[PDB]
Amino acid sequence: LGLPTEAYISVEEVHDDGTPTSKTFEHVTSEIGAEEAEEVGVEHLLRDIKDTTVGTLSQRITNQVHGLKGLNSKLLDIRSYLEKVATGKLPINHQIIYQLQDVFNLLPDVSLQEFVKAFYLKTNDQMVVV
């Protein structure tokens, strides 16, 4: 589901939280990129098991299925962490809770009539093109 690399930077600062502060890690956004001279080698090594660099309908449907898989796995991880913090095994991480609050704030409303009408309009346009 995810990349093989997790990045951490050691930050030690007085917790504005007001809690005892200990020198611990903080996650850093990570990505996989390649030089061109490394892209050539990577592609050559993967030539036999490579996928098409184009969206073929079967592969696009498969990509959507994999997206659903990833979303389910992430939601399961969050639910397990919530279980643990609720029961008491782990402490309440305020940044985690803030981000979860923002996520639930960000969930859309799909039963709205003004949205249902636009959705049906766009679906009909796409279906007439099809």
């Binding site: 799909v110 039963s111 249902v116 959705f119 679906t123």
Partner: peptide, 14 residues
């Protein structure tokens, strides 16, 4: 007032 998203997805996958 409710989108039958499951049925529509069934049709599109078909």
């Amino acid at each position: 007032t409710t989108i039958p998203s499951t049925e529509l997805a069934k049709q599109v996958i078909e």
